[PDB]
């Protein structure tokens, strides 16, 4: 049923969470601006830099293994990656290039290029359902039937099996995260920016799994959206941020916990839910990052690793904080002292401790 | 310029042609009903049985090597193959399944399945142009822009580069051969059922290479087609066969010669053109097959092998002819005597001798 988040909590985040840090290796062949998305594969970390659109492979220890494909307009090359996935059998890695309207398939074992196909429709993110069919999101708002739904399930070959979740508010402007589909074991879950509900989505099912409520705020109404968007024609995002409503919200789930980052009154918050105890804890990120002694926490990467939530930290930004006597975490400061000003992000691995 | 075919010729076909025969091996794993299309690849013969839709690999000696994929509705499986091609680099073999609206890619070396994509539009046959782009035929007659052309050139990914050859008469009913695109060296050629002209087709070119004229007959006029087809709605094929016009015509070209099978007044004819001497010879197939001492010659397979035209011969049909004292060719009769009544077709390899 409901996961109620109260505004404040007087419990320190340091006590209820267990931390870990990892330094990513910094070579000319593997420079990283942003850690947009992350996935485990054997004893490696698949990382997508959605700022520069490079797909990299790193090791558990932080060593660079290899790049998956490269940038360019040819076959097997890409311009702007929004997402990727590993098939259930671990044969291929399929990356989605939204700039060139294609899907590129690489080998899951050796990382070489296999083949490329065109995207069947306007979409940014996809995942393989346990039965083998593919769940894609629908980024359409035109005449098309697909424009009246949030997601769509297709077969291996991309022919549409069924359209999923009715989309009332239609617009060219999207507000939520780019990746709004994830896995927990074999089950695939999905969610939308104007419905505080996570649905477990199969080929012939839409069943809610979690619903949220936050004290003193909520998602925008349908009327508020249409008035501030001229029925979908204009960008409501500015007016949305001026209101008391929930501006943005992303969800990452593991076996033990569930983190909910969101925006309200122009400020970033994070709600932690401990599934074992059934307890919620809400923190403004300004408070959250100072309590864990990590300086800045601009965003959480989508994906998790051994049930740990990932958050890349900017080295230079933190080194200046350290230089100004910022009281850092023992293990973070140890890695920060051996890091050059130009080094890639130090990843924060964090979860609810049992 | 023109290749004029006179009705009759009083030169025997036995004198101007050189023959050869090959027996295909007959196992339960490689039963063949029809030899629809044939292509060379290393020292092997790729054969498509378009009657049963099985793609086979045979050896120069006639031994069965392996089947390319198999029949079925799954990934890598097919229902109804119309054509296939080998890429210029000899990496893959791409077969077109018109039943399931997909293209299946297999390995050119080991014959295992690589990947499958959907056909970009209604089409039956394709070939890679020397520059790398793909030439496809257009089997559309609806609203679509592609319905107003005979062929279309697309990139690697299937996006349309340019539409080729204006199609005046539009209909759901097609009269010519299924494969109307071929190679001679690196150049790709194409032709239509109502234009006695072979065009060399590139990405930015339509240049005629050969034009034909036959004594006492011609292709149907545009008016004859529209009257007998109710402006494309009805099947004109019956009325077409009742007329003196050319009912059907297929062309196979090599470096040394060019064979033209066609239909007229309900009877099959064959025009041989010797490029070296610049001489034509026309024969009704009833006369042609008796002159070469081969009994029945129902059809010529599309494709050639070391500049030899291929024609599969039915064993049982010929063995009964032999049983009735038919005066067969020495080498054909030698293979026919060691052939069982149930054995696959004996291929006739024939060309203009130098």
Automatic annotation (TrEMBL), chains A, B:
It comes from the Bacteria. This is Exported protein. It comes from Bacteroides fragilis (strain ATCC 25285 / DSM 2151 / CCUG 4856 / JCM 11019 / LMG 10263 / NCTC 9343 / Onslow / VPI 2553 / EN-2).
